[PDB]
């Protein structure tokens, strides 16, 4: 494999997906330098489960999937196997058998602005927790009670999406962070997403 994996598009993308509406891309037949990923000090979080980053340059996988959204700094703990809370439960759930790498960096410079930036959303409520890698962009009215809702916001009937308000003055735990989850997939198939060393 000669051509380069377009991880650069994923990471240097100017526009980034709201988290309930989280963006997935497949990276498929390409060779990558993962060093440019780990050998870099932009990344507040860089955790890997099932792989060790320094070896990713020897290793070929059949597919890599890049999921990317924005979340608050405190929530980056929720993007992990066996984790709970309104992000892990209602917007993005990684599976307990995950083999891959959560990567996150602080993005207050771009995703927060004076007066607030409200262009990002998230799902406070859901009837049930999500399935691993389940995406859900519904705007249906949450009903926890007995009396139904007719698209009616009221007693026990709440619109399921809320906006992030990102301000420059916000404490670090409530500032916007851009997140990127790489799943390294191993199928008994040929493997064409390879590290820099064959």
């Amino acid at each position: 494999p000669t051509n380069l994996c377009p991880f650069g598009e994923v990471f240097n993308a100017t526009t980034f997906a709201s988290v309930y509406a989280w963006n997935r891309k497949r990276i498929s037949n390409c060779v990558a330098d993962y060093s440019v990923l780990y050998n870099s000090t932009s990344f507040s979080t860089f955790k890997c489960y099932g792989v060790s980053p320094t070896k990713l340059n020897d290793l070929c996988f059949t597919n890599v999937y890049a999921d990317s959204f924005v979340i608050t700094g405190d929530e980056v703990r929720q993007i992990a196997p066996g984790q709970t809370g309104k992000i892990a439960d209602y917007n993005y759930k990684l599976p307990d058998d995950f083999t891959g790498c959560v990567i996150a960096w602080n993005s207050k410079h771009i995703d927060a602005k004076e007066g607030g930036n409200f262009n990002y959303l998230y799902r406070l409520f859901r009837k049930a927790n999500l399935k691993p890698f389940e995406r859900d962009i519904s705007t249906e009215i949450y009903q926890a009670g007995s009396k139904p809702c007719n698209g009616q916001t009221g007693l026990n009937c709440y619109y399921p999406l809320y906006r992030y308000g990102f301000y420059p003055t916000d404490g670090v735990g409530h500032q916007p962070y851009r997140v990127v989850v790489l799943s390294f997939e191993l199928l008994n198939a040929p493997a064409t997403v390879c590290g820099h060393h064959h």
Binding site: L124, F125, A144, Y158, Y162, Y167, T169
Partner: protein
């Protein structure tokens, strides 16, 4: 089942998002006072009020006695009971017009020199100075009588209207009166020996005050003796202190009587303010030092935003600003302090106090919004003074800073220190209890409006041993001329804070293994004592305060004994000075 919880998370997240926006609007005002910036506060202050009234009413949809998890029930009860001003449309807005008008008449007070009529002065910078620095009786009398004449009288009709609508509001929330509503803050349900009813409070306040009274009486006769040196022929040896002759504009603290009352003048003074001026301390460095204090007991450092977003220096922008110190929890991990901090020892000491509040805000953010608060209203001020107790000791001032370390610390300086303490701390206790005992009585109807001043001054004379220069009929509204009264703030907190301080510092110092006098205790370098305090802060309002108290001091109510122990040496000294004189006061 309890769908209340699924309601609460919705409230929790909508609350902080707007309260964030309310805080930001307010802060932009306080640091930059514009017509535009004043207006934007009201828009956010409007939205937040509108937001609460619906949640209050929506909360009522959920019955509090179906809820078993006490933590969830406690939040629900706060929402349906507190702020539930479902009064009437023409009275939720008459009350607000009353509450702005009183707030700003006080803010805009100007009284004039009876001999220099065009010389008129605001309280916030100017008149405060005369009342902290002057020894000219007639000068203080007009500044005192003037403020009570010019602003107090304008506030009298408002207070009367304030009373009715507030009592109505509290009636609607199943409370006997606004006073009952206020005392409700100390109510706590656990049904396990940690329960506390509102009507225990006045019993426990009057119980502890009875224990404090001797000490106060002796501090009073001593201060009276030294003051007849400065005002012979105006102070009777056997009677009350004139109200215009104390530390400040009211008799609230006696701090600025120290110059006049210092037991041992000839001991070298302890005031470290010149050493900072010598050493080129500036605002930043003072807080960097208070940071070191907290770090040293194991609390966190400050946030980066605290440095960049705080206002420490009063601006030279010409930006006009409210210079009164405050510590802001703006809901988003955004903590700031707003202080015009000058390079003195007293500011150094308050910056330790006010960073105390920031630490308590940081400490409980792990809580749902409705529980981000101190276990009762007494706990936040107690937590900030705990800091000043340790950082004002000579032991502390030597180590980190510029007491000379060649400093002689003997029985004579210790009495000097305690007297300084008692003037500000023990002096305030009668002044504060007598004020809430008025308000409580006024809200309960025990005092007709035709005897408000008649019964205020009578109470002043009986309890604070303070009396008034000129006689005041019912056209004055003297209590309204303190900030907290005309800005609708509960006040007994400054009493309960005061007893808590010494309960904490005693148990905390015992965890730091300090030996000897409690008042020379400095907690610095004790991670053990810090963890002990850090546990309860974290709890926020999420458990009854009675349980929070015991998790530190191992007691479940106010105990005065630590305060008595702390001032024990000054007690023996004072009783000797007064030994063949009168201890008490006449009421004529």
């Amino acid at each position: 089942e309890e769908l209340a919880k699924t309601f609460l998370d919705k409230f929790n997240q909508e609350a902080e998002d707007l309260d964030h926006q309310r805080s930001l609007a307010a802060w932009n005002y306080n640091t930059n006072i514009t017509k535009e910036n004043t207006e934007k506060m009201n828009e956010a202050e409007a939205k937040w009020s509108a937001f609460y009234e619906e949640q209050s009413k929506l909360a009522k949809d959920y019955p509090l006695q179906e809820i078993q998890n006490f933590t969830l029930k406690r939040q629900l009860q706060a929402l349906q009971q507190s702020g539930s001003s479902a009064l009437s449309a023409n009275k939720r807005e008459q009350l607000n017009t009353i509450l702005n008008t009183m707030s700003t008449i006080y803010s805009t007070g100007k009284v004039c020199n009876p001999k220099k009529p065009q010389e008129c002065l605001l309280l916030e910078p100017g008149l405060d100075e005369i009342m902290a620095n002057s020894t000219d009786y007639s000068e203080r009398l007009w500044v005192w009588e003037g403020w009570r004449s010019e602003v107090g009288k304008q506030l009298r009709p408002l207070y009367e209207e304030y009373v009715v609508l507030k009592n109505e509001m509290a009636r609607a929330n199943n409370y006997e009166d606004y006073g009952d509503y206020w005392r409700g803050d100390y109510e706590a349900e656990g049904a396990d020996g940690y329960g506390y009813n509102r009507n225990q409070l006045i019993e426990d306040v009057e119980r502890t005050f009875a224990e404090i009274k001797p000490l106060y009486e002796h501090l009073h006769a001593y201060v009276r003796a030294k003051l007849m040196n400065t005002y012979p022929s105006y102070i009777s040896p056997t009677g009350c202190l004139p109200a215009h002759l104390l530390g400040d504009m009211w008799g609230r603290f006696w701090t600025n009587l120290y110059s006049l009352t210092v037991p041992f003048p000839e001991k070298p003074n302890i005031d470290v303010t010149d050493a900072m001026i010598n050493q080129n301390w500036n605002a930043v460095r003072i807080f960097k030092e208070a940071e070191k204090f907290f770090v040293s007991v194991g609390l966190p450092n400050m946030t980066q935003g605290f440095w960049e977003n705080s206002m420490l220096t009063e601006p030279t922008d010409g930006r006009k600003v409210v210079c009164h110190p405050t510590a802001w929890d703006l809901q988003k991990g955004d903590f700031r302090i707003k202080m015009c901090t000058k390079v003195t020892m007293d500011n150094f000491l308050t910056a330790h106090h006010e960073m105390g509040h920031i630490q308590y805000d940081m400490a409980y953010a792990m809580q749902p919004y409705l529980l981000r608060n101190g276990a009762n209203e007494g706990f936040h001020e107690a937590v900030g003074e705990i800091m000043s107790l340790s950082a004002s000791t000579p032991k502390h001032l030597k180590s980190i800073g510029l007491l000379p370390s060649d400093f002689r610390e003997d029985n004579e300086t210790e009495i000097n220190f305690l007297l300084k303490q008692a003037l500000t701390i023990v002096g305030t206790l009668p002044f504060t209890y007598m004020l809430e005992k008025w308000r409580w009585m006024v809200f309960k109807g025990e005092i007709p409006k035709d005897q408000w001043m008649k019964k205020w001054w009578e109470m002043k004379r009986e309890i604070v041993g303070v009396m008034e220069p000129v006689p005041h009929d019912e056209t004055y509204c003297d209590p309204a001329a303190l900030y907290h009264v005309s800005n609708d703030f509960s006040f007994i907190r400054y009493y309960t804070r005061t007893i808590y301080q010494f309960q904490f510092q005693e148990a905390l110092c015992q965890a730091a293994k300090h030996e000897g006098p409690l008042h020379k205790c400095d907690i610095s370098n004790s991670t053990e004592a810090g963890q002990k305090l850090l546990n309860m802060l974290r709890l926020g309002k999420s458990k009854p305060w009675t349980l929070a108290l015991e998790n530190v001091v191992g007691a479940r109510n106010m105990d005065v004994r630590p305060l008595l122990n702390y001032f024990e040496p000054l007690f023996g000294w004072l009783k000797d000075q007064n030994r063949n004189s009168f201890v008490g006061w006449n009421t004529d």
